[PDB]
């Protein structure tokens, strides 16, 4: 009943479920990737492991 | 993207039995579904829409069942007047679909 | 709602910056993760209903 | 067994240090024992208590 408030209106709800483990990663964030550097003090991030 | 098949190809059963038709989907289409009947030399008519709701002016003998992937159309009693072809329509997603309707199933009633 | 769909998401990159125009007036209240840094994360299995 | 005392001193120190370093992997009732994991798993407001 669109005349009434939003409580009587259609709502489309999408539910996402993750597992959030950093090793068998197949769905990652949109951030880019950079070449690695060895033998230097760096703050890395491997598949979400910082 | 969405493809369906309709089975059986044809059915035959005397006047007192119940005839049932299966409409199965490659992937789930939820409730979205419709059943259509055409008499020979006559355009099809809607019988069951939303896979459960009876149409207008249709007698209370045709039952639609199932949700998601498998759907069944069951007629409690035949009277040799429902001998026609029935189709099921996806009515869910037709972006790139060869045919919204499924296969043909002709009902034969021997009285 | 009773016949809710289930979708598998895998072997792809997931971005949230696009989830504004497609679903305006959205509400992403959720649990178990901070939505602010969803950009720098990886997911083994994602299910969309 | 003649030199038991000095060996006991060395073993005591080594095992105390080993226990101290090994206890660092204790959960203490958190969701994870790695504080990096806590930071990338929760909004701050609960991150402070964890």
In short:
Chain A is mostly loops and 50 residues long. Chain A has strands spanning 16-17, 27-28.
Q: What topology does this entry show?
A:
This is part of a larger assembly, with three copies of chain A and one copy of chain B (111 residues).
Chain A: E1 16-17, E2 27-28
Chain B: E1 4-7, E2 10-12, E3 19-25, E4 34-38, E5 44-49, E6 53-54, E7 62-65, E8 70-75, E9 85-89, E10 105-108
Parallel strand pairs in B: 2-10
Antiparallel strand pairs in B: 1-3, 3-8, 4-5, 4-9, 5-6, 7-8, 9-10
Distance between the termini of chain A: 50 Å
N-to-C order of helices and strands of chain B: EEEEEEEEEE
Largest sheet of chain A: none
Overall CATH class of chain B: Mainly Beta
How many helices of chain A does DSSP assign?
0
Instruction: Give the CATH architecture of chain B.
Output: Sandwich
Main beta-sheet strand count, sense and barrel state of chain B: 6 strands, mixed
Residues in helices of chain A, as a percent range: under 10%
User: Which percent range describes the beta-strand content of chain A?
Assistant: 5-15%
Q: Helical element count of chain B?
A: 0
The computed structural class of chain B is mainly beta
Task: Work out the radius of gyration of chain B.
Answer: 13 Å
Helix-and-strand structural type of chain A: little secondary structure
């Amino acid at each position: 009943r669109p005349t009434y408030g939003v409580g009587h209106q259609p709502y489309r709800v999408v539910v996402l479920s993750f597992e959030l483990l950093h090793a068998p990663a197949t769905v990652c964030g949109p951030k880019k990737s950079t070449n690695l550097v060895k033998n230097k003090c760096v703050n890395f991030n491997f598949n979400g492991l910082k | 993207d969405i493809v369906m098949t309709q089975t059986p190809a044809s059915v035959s059963e005397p006047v007192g039995g119940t005839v049932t038709i299966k409409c199965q989907a490659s992937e789930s289409i939820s409730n979205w579904l419709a059943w259509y009947q055409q008499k020979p030399g006559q355009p099809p008519k809607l019988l069951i829409y939303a896979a459960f709701t009876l149409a207008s002016g249709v007698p209370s003998r045709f039952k639609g069942s199932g949700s998601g992937t498998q759907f069944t159309l069951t007629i409690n009693g035949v009277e040799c007047a429902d001998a026609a072809t029935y189709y099921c329509q996806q009515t869910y997603s037709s972006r790139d679909v060869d045919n919204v309707f499924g296969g043909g199933t002709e009902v034969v009633v021997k009285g | 709602v009773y016949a809710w769909n289930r979708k598998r998401i895998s072997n792809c990159v997931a971005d949230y910056s696009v989830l504004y125009n497609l679903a305006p007036f959205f509400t992403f209240k959720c649990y178990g993760v901070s939505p602010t840094k969803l950009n720098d994360l990886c997911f083994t299995n994602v299910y969309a209903d | 067994s003649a030199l038991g005392k000095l060996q006991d001193v060395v073993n005591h120190n080594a095992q105390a240090l080993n226990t101290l370093v090994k206890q660092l992997s204790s959960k203490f009732g958190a969701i994870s024992s790695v504080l990096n994991d806590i930071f990338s798993r929760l909004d701050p407001p609960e991150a402070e208590v964890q």
